[PDB]
Amino acid sequence: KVKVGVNGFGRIGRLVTRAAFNSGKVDIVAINDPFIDLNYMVYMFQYDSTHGKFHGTVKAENGKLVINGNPITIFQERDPSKIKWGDAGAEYVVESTGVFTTMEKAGAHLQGGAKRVIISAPSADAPMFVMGVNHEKYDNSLKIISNASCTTNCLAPLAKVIHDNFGIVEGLMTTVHAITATQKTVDGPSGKLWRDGRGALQNIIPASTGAAKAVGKVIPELNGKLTGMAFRVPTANVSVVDLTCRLEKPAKYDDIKKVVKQASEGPLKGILGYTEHQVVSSDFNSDTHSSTFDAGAGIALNDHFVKLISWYDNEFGYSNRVVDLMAHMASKE
Amino acid sequence: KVKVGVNGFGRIGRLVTRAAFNSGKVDIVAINDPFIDLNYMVYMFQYDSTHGKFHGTVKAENGKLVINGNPITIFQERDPSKIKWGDAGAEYVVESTGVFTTMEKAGAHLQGGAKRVIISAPSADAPMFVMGVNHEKYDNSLKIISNASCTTNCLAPLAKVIHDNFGIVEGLMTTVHAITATQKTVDGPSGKLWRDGRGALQNIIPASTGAAKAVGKVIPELNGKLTGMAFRVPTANVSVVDLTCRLEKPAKYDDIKKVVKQASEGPLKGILGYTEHQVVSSDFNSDTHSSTFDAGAGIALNDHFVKLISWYDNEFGYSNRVVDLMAHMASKE
Amino acid sequence: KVKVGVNGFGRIGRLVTRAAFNSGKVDIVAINDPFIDLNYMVYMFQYDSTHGKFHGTVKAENGKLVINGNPITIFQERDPSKIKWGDAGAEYVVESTGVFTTMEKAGAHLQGGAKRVIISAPSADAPMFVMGVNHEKYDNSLKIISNASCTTNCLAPLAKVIHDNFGIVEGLMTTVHAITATQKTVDGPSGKLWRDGRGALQNIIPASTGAAKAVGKVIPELNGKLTGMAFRVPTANVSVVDLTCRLEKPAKYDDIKKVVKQASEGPLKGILGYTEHQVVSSDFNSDTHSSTFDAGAGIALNDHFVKLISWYDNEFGYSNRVVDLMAHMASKE
Amino acid sequence: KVKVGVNGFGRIGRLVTRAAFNSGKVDIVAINDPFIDLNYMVYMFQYDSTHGKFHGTVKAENGKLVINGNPITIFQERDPSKIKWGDAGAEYVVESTGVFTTMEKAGAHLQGGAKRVIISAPSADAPMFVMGVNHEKYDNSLKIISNASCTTNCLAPLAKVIHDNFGIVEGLMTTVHAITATQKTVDGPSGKLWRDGRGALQNIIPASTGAAKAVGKVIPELNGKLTGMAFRVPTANVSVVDLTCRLEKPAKYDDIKKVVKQASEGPLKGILGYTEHQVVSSDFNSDTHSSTFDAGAGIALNDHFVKLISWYDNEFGYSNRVVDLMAHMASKE
Numbered sequence A, B, C, D: 001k002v003k004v005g006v007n008g009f010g011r012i013g014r015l016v017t018r019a020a021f022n023s024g025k026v027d028i029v030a031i032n033d034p035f036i037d038l039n040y041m042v043y044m045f046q047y048d049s050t051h052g053k054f055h056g057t058v059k060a061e062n063g064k065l066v067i068n069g070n071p072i073t074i075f076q077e078r079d080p081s082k083i084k085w086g087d088a089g090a091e092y093v094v095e096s097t098g099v100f101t102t103m104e105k106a107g108a109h110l111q112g113g114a115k116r117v118i119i120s121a122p123s124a125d126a127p128m129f130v131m132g133v134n135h136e137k138y139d140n141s142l143k144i145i146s147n148a149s150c151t152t153n154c155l156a157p158l159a160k161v162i163h164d165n166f167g168i169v170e171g172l173m174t175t176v177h178a179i180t181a182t183q184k185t186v187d188g189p190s191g192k193l194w195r196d197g198r199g200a201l202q203n204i205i206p207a208s209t210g211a212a213k214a215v216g217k218v219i220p221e222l223n224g225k226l227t228g229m230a231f232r233v234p235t236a237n238v239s240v241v242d243l244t245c246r247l248e249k250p251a252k253y254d255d256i257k258k259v260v261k262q263a264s265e266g267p268l269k270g271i272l273g274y275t276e277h278q279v280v281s282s283d284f285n286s287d288t289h290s291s292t293f294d295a296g297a298g299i300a301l302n303d304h305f306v307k308l309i310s311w312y313d314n315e316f317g318y319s320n321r322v323v324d325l326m327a328h329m330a331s332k333e
């Protein structure tokens, strides 16, 4: 059982930790966050507005965070290279601060004694992976990798099934995404793009995303045939992907439904979901799937042009994939 | 100046009235709503959460609603055929209850003495019109007409310009729409579709719409080449249309921008807007345009496949179009 | 084990049912709702935006609603007196439509064969009860009773403890309440009071409540010494009570904390809760307590004038009390 | 006409600027914000989610911000003492960063050439003032002053009138406040109090405030007789104060209504408002009053114990008071 260290106790850092202690697939032994001390970590991990109170025990004991009886070493370093991952016995490190996404910056963890690093976000140069799509392409020579983005983990699975069966000639996607820590409560200085600084509670905010283009990296055949954008809307969690694409081989909507369902009962079980139920966003709260095909919400213009809908809990789904990914890597050691 | 009667003092009934008194294009002389008495009408017309307090005077005087000094006759009939439009001197009647959308049901107003009826919603059989797209096709032989839907008035104008210039081979649209009176505050009984009864404040709700297909009625050439669906998100007003289409003639994004801008400065001025500003939904509050092209939010995959974005205040824009339409009809008498 | 029938499958009707099947304190055998058919009942009971998917089995089988293997008879009557409670074997009936709150109207259920009726709301004439405050005063001669309101079940328990220990000279309360089915998504025609028709998502809405005055009914000594009002804010669930009162006997805040805590560990265990944690509204989601004293949020001006804060899940807490109440009545048969 | 400089182009800095250009009471000649450059300042000042697009002209011209034709010098200093207020000709400086509230820190502006400094927030040592309550007590010997807080400017005016007429023995207040820039979109590291870091969109958040206690500073007679707390709820703007107090001299609610109304038509005209209308929070959007008594929402237990309600646009009201205050100071030069 691989021992893990988490850098950045945010929504993803905390939820990866929560997912790790639930499946017991990996063991969190150390956490680092200079802006959150031990006592605060207990409070933030225990209580969660969107996912409910933690089912288990959380305590500060001897300067360590104890979850379900397991003591965790706490670090307060601002500089990654300074963190003593080795002494804490952390073999893999989850880079989830959103500030060290380049292969070089995320590599700082290796100086501390870590053996591998998983960036919980897209990376400009590090190899990106998506469970159920291209994780098999991972090997031991890789020390620094990326688990892509929440949106990419939703689109890729669906795109794979659709492409493998009918071939995607070209596609454009839109994602109606829930607000995130990046946004502001009221009009304020955005970090990066001007629209993102506008009140998150009052507006529908157009935003760019490289998610669709990133699918071209995990599924090379689709490289350059996809692109899209996003809309941030005022909900705390759970998002939906709207994929509009031209098919190479004709396919009635019911054939697409048949194909996606089989994929969800087979290889992609637990990754890609399938439903014909009259669902709404909150029905996916704390759902661990990376993507769930919504049969009733999609629509086809004809046998070559269709709009496919898929839901995803951007916090929970992604988090579990980070754990699933590490579990996979460990089995390759 | 044509005298108008409004059936149903709801969001649209009230806003059409507000728009009428502002432009003075038409004169509201009577209103009918069995679930709202005179005093309540004063309160609901004066105060408006989304559009602000009414700039003017509103009062109950001698059993009449007096707006800016103009006395309005009030009716409390549940049955349309019973309303005495003729005695009140109402020549045109705005059917905005959402319960009499068929040519037959909306015709009841003619028995009361009305000369023409405008359904403020799509109709199964009545001829639909969209200002700036096919209003010229209206003639005096038509007693009962429809002004289409908020969403159709947004899509049609944009589709027209895009089709006239590059030709739309096929298109699929999605609309992220603000909540409406139809929805529920918490999970409850749905009037029609099951998902629509789910809490409007907590969920992103997939919904079907005939808007895209309705564009085929006002723009015959596009008949059968368009379709789409909707997502209801938790905002009080203002919506956005996402049009994904294949072009017949190649066109760089900048050519599309050039073409739409010219259209907004010419014939469609006041109907179709154009902006390159970093806008968000609330920047369109109380905006009277039927549709506003958002240059920076759209994206193109290539010269034949592109995603176009257009904003619309589903309450204010539509309302003004209802008045504009009546003003047009009147000039044809 | 008493057999129960539920009239009105709304937020309370569904949650009382959910609470009944969980504690197994009572057995739901029949449900009546003319606006929701069997199949719809399955969907609405299974999926819940605020409390999550039902943890059990829900199905339509032989025209009956089957929850966790227990078949429930479904009725579609609009008129209470017509419901055949007797044939279904329902001894107690939960009146939760919000339309039959008078002793006379709620009595209609007796004609159908019901033996007792519990109004899940305040009543103008039926005897009101609050678990842990005056349920002991219930006896078999009562056929029609009321379980008060969500807010009264929160205030009463706290007031009791505070009065019994220091004496309440006079008090005024305010409740910041989550939105409910009564409100509108956008400015529209209000049930009874004009402000209540304003958009629930956009405004803080002042509202009157008889809750504080009702405490004078369950705790006669406080009769006429309390009153208050409410504010509806844009959250889907969970509310908080702010009690400001003058004490007869002096009492340091810490003495009040000591006293309330003892009450929560003793007689009121499960009814009145106590916490010193840095809580927020969502930390009480699906919490079954009727009221939870928040030590850190309250504040005292002096030893006789203080402001006490108590949280309550207005949906879940109340629902469990309805079941607890019926369980109590049954033990008195 | 006094020339003004604004330090910190945030919600208050921008709205003070907007209010200044509207009333023309003062002339903004310079603005300083190291996290917002000229072009960004144009965008943020022009578009406003809660108060609408700016009515006028805003442009970047020759490295200056030009509003309605008036050129404004832009500074990018992080350190107050470095800002060249003197060269820009700024006589008064509005300290609205929320980071320099002490008399010493805010004094740094004097080194740059400023003559006076107004802290747009409460201060630990600088003299606090509230228009219509104690501004007359301001004199030329004061170089550094405070305009108190949004909440204090709401409570003080009302308390004054109530105290002057019936005498306040003791009082406790609660304020249901809209979210602010301080809060987070999702559970995250709070700057300061632990509850304040919880998702602003999902929770009702208890918060402490020194507002009630600060009234004891602007109205010495009430010193030590008032205190209270706050609740942050999910609305973008507009807040309400709930004052519960014991009166020295008996007073029927209607006498309180008579007294407050007279005060709003007299001396406090423009500061303290009065209404008997069925209002809700959004009816106060962009309302420049510091406080507006809501007759219909309040309630009295008896002639000595009552609950008074007052609304306030925490952004707009406060902003205008900052300008009004400077206008007053200038008339004393």
Ligand SMILES: NC(=O)c1ccc[n+]([C@@H]2O[C@H](COP(=O)([O-])OP(=O)(O)OC[C@H]3O[C@@H](n4cnc5c(N)ncnc54)[C@H](O)[C@@H]3O)[C@@H](O)[C@H]2O)c1
Pocket: A007, A008, A009, A010, A011, A012, A013, A032, A033, A034, A035, A036, A077, A078, A079, A096, A097, A098, A099, A120, A121, A149, A150, A180, A181, A314, A315, A318, D188, D189
């Ligand atoms: N928010 C989502 O739903 C979501 C889903 C998938 C992927 N992601 C990606 O994962 C990352 C995590 O985002 P998140 O929502 O958890 O954000 P977050 O802001 O909640 O978490 C970031 C954490 O980083 C900590 N931190 C900041 N600087 C640090 C430093 N120098 N060293 C160590 N720790 C530091 C912060 O204290 C905080 O707890 C982002 O890059 C995001 O793009 C987020």
Ligand SMILES: NC(=O)c1ccc[n+]([C@@H]2O[C@H](COP(=O)([O-])OP(=O)(O)OC[C@H]3O[C@@H](n4cnc5c(N)ncnc54)[C@H](O)[C@@H]3O)[C@@H](O)[C@H]2O)c1
Pocket: B007, B008, B009, B010, B011, B012, B013, B032, B033, B034, B035, B036, B077, B078, B079, B080, B096, B097, B098, B099, B120, B121, B149, B150, B151, B180, B181, B314, B315, B318, C187, C188, C189
């Ligand atoms: N709401 C929008 O933004 C929008 C945009 C485009 C089209 N529409 C369509 O316009 C219609 C107006 O919808 P709305 O949003 O104003 O709904 P609403 O509920 O706000 O207003 C409808 C009004 O109809 C009144 N009414 C009900 N039965 C009546 C009867 N028999 N006679 C007279 N009045 C009666 C109701 O009391 C209410 O005041 C609907 O068909 C809607 O689909 C709405």
Ligand SMILES: NC(=O)c1ccc[n+]([C@@H]2O[C@H](COP(=O)([O-])OP(=O)(O)OC[C@H]3O[C@@H](n4cnc5c(N)ncnc54)[C@H](O)[C@@H]3O)[C@@H](O)[C@H]2O)c1
Pocket: B187, B188, B189, C007, C008, C009, C010, C011, C012, C013, C032, C033, C034, C035, C036, C077, C078, C079, C096, C097, C098, C099, C120, C121, C122, C149, C150, C180, C181, C314, C315, C318
């Ligand atoms: N919502 C709360 O948090 C809460 C807490 C305590 C008490 N209550 C009280 O409980 C009652 C339940 O309110 P609710 O919030 O669940 O509202 P709701 O609208 O969610 O539920 C009411 C149900 O009544 C049904 N109904 C309507 N007319 C009927 C009829 N003639 N016969 C049978 N069923 C009929 C409706 O279909 C609906 O399912 C109200 O009286 C309310 O005051 C509610």
Ligand SMILES: NC(=O)c1ccc[n+]([C@@H]2O[C@H](COP(=O)([O-])OP(=O)(O)OC[C@H]3O[C@@H](n4cnc5c(N)ncnc54)[C@H](O)[C@@H]3O)[C@@H](O)[C@H]2O)c1
Pocket: A187, A188, A189, D007, D008, D009, D010, D011, D012, D013, D032, D033, D034, D035, D036, D077, D078, D079, D096, D097, D098, D099, D120, D121, D149, D150, D151, D180, D181, D314, D315, D318
């Ligand atoms: N938000 C309200 O409605 C309201 C009402 C009354 C009083 N106040 C008080 O006024 C102050 C203003 O709050 P706000 O809502 O505008 O917050 P804000 O974050 O919107 O504005 C603060 C501004 O400070 C700038 N800034 C940060 N460090 C700086 C530095 N060293 N030099 C110059 N500029 C710097 C930021 O870029 C930002 O634009 C706060 O102390 C607040 O408590 C706020």
